[PDB]
């Protein structure tokens, strides 16, 4: 039973539980969180985006990142012994190597970690609703870090690990993709908002419902941990909303499973749309519109306004953003309002 | 402007007149909003992840609670036993009231900030300016990621409200 | 006609026949931060050109 | 051919739709315009 010997140690309730998952979760989830930091503070992307990454270059926390590789690369996974660096940390470092890296390890860390839930909840004995709730996130990351890139041009065009780095990613999408106009993303929004609304509607819906089942003027000493039953009377709170906002809950059993849906749900939505951006197959135009616009210098909708932004946030961008496609942009050619 | 697309316009303008994506305030809207989403998933998760046993797929499990009962359909410590087991203990919540509060704590705390952020820039104390910041020895300009962010900004900057201003500086 | 220039941009339904398009357009620079009370527009048609409906709401 | 036992009654409550009827009807409004294009 040597198999149970290893097992035996592993899943032994240490301080910070290890586990079988531990052999996947922990390593990848390390060189990733790690690698980020490593390049965040030492490596330059100057040979892929001719821009500064590391803190060494002078870059700021916000302005730092492990920039995706030059589009010249493709989707080649830039192995260290990959014919790219041919096996050479210094160069492999310069050719962006860390990206495929950080991404892929984080890939397996996110795997190893979702499995990190299924393990525990199965030992401790509980519904797999945590790990299940991790779908939301594996989607988001998978949609925006692997499929996107893959279905597009290079690994390049994929997000780049940093703040200002992704902030770019954003504008990028608003520009040539006009993401903000997509049905999906407009749902992701729905999730990430409501889910937060819930997280708080209920949050403080609680702090202001519960009872005086402790002495002092502070609620921390208040009953628990699991003893007396329930702190908030779901009835006294009920009639509060059923009279203010019209409709309230009943059954905390669902209010705890509708709190899951909301975000994990909407967050998955976007993830789809995003695959759609891979094949540039996005929601950009409203035919009925451009045609009615074409032949009438007197019809303007926000839609068109927004639509003009894009050209702007594109003509000015692209060149210094997509170095590999040697953009040559004369002063005239470049679109721009009158006087500005 | 009140209407789906007007939002965006209103927004994009903003990002182009105030580096509002380069704000340690707008961060705090995301910070929390991008939290509540992260947390609503938890308490919703765990809670549902810990329900006694009242029907056995005859019908559903969301019946393990007739309204009004003073019991708590879900098990508290049965719950923590998990998260404490996910990320080392001390890290998972022990007291239930210190929990639910934290749920107004995350959202409201930053959603306020954001609310302030915009309200702050309505006076022109905009997001970080790093344009060019990072320099070279001779003096060549070495690009900061946030420099790119500048073009996708200058881009929208120029085109917005075209033919509506006859001078070179937008002071509003 | 939001921005000052007289070049009305009216997204709407009975014009901008769509849901994502249309919306309620703002007040016009012209009468800026100024209170435009429906009962000012010498014609409800005027209170219309100048985003009057916006404010009130 | 004796009746079937695995034939339990089909479950659905009066506000279950009030949750769905909303979601679908609203889901409609959004995704509509993108249909009219």
């Amino acid at each position: 039973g040597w198999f149970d010997i290893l097992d035996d140690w592993l899943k032994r309730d240490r301080f910070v539980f290890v586990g079988w998952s531990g052999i996947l979760l922990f390593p990848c989830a390390y060189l990733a969180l790690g690698g980020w930091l490593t390049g965040t503070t030492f490596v330059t992307s100057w040979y892929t985006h001719g821009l500064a990454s590391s803190y060494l270059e002078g870059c700021n926390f916000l302005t730092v990142a492990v920039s995706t590789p030059a589009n010249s690369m493709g989707h080649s996974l830039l192995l260290l012994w990959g014919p790219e660096a041919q096996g050479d940390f210094t160069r492999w470092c310069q050719l962006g190597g860390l990206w495929t890296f950080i991404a892929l390890h984080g890939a397996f860390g996110l795997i190893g970690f979702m499995l990190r839930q299924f393990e525990i909840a199965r030992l401790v004995g509980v519904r797999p609703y945590n790990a299940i709730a991790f779908s939301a996130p594996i989607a988001v990351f998978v949609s925006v870090f692997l499929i996107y890139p893959l279905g597009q041009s290079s690994w390049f065009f994929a997000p780049s690990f940093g703040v200002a780095a992704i902030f770019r990613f954003l504008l990028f999408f608003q520009g040539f993709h006009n993401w903000t106009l997509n049905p999906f993303h407009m749902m992701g929004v729905a999730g990430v908002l409501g889910g937060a609304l819930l997280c708080a509607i209920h949050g403080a819906t609680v702090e202001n419902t519960l009872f005086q089942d402790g002495e002092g003027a502070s609620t921390f000493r208040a009953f628990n941990p699991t003893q007396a039953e329930e702190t908030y009377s779901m009835v006294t709170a009920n009639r509060f909303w059923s009279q203010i906002f019209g409709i309230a809950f009943s059954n905390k059993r669902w209010l705890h499973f509708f709190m899951l849906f909301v975000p994990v749900t909407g967050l998955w939505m976007s993830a789809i749309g995003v695959v759609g951006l891979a094949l540039n197959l996005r929601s950009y135009d409203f035919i009925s519109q451009e045609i009615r616009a074409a032949e009438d210098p007197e019809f303007e909708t926000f839609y068109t306004k927004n639509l003009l932004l894009n050209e702007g946030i594109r003509a000015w961008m692209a060149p210094q953003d997509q170095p590999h496609e040697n953009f040559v942009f004369p002063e005239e050619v470049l679109p721009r309002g009158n006087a500005l | 402007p009140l209407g789906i697309s007007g939002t965006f316009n209103f927004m994009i303008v903003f990002q182009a007149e105030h580096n509002i994506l380069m704000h340690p305030f707008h961060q705090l809207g995301v910070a929390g909003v991008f939290g509540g989403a992260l947390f609503c998933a938890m308490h919703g998760s765990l809670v549902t992840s810990s329900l006694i046993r009242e029907t056995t797929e005859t019908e559903s499990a969301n019946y393990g609670y007739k309204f009004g009962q003073e019991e708590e359909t879900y098990n508290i410590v049965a719950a923590h036993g998990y998260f404490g087991r996910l990320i080392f203990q001390y890290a998972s919540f022990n007291n239930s009231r210190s929990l639910h509060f934290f749920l107004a704590a995350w959202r409201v705390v930053g959603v306020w900030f954001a609310a302030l952020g915009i309200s702050t820039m309505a006076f022109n104390l905009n997001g970080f300016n790093f344009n060019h910041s990072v320099i070279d020895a001779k003096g060549n300009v070495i690009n900061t990621w946030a420099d790119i962010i500048n073009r996708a900004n200058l881009g929208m900057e120029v085109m917005h409200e075209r033919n509506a201003h006859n001078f070179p500086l937008d002071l509003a | 006609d939001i921005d000052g220039i007289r070049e009305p941009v009216s997204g709407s339904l009975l014009y901008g026949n769509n849901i994502i398009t249309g919306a309620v357009v703002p007040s016009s620079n012209a009468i800026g931060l100024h209170f435009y009370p429906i009962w000012e527009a010498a014609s409800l048609d005027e209170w219309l050109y100048n985003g009057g409906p916006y404010q009130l709401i | 051919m004796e009746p079937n036992p695995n034939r339990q009654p089909v479950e659905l409550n009066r506000t279950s739709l009030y949750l769905g009827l909303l979601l679908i009807l609203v889901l409609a409004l959004l995704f509509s315009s993108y249909f009219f294009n």
Partner: peptide, 30 residues
Amino acid sequence: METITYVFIFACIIALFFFAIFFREPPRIT
């Protein structure tokens, strides 16, 4: 159409609103 198509789906959400704040099926206390 559409202009109508849009108004309707709306004049409905208002219905389904009226139906849930008044034909709500009372929460029972047992």
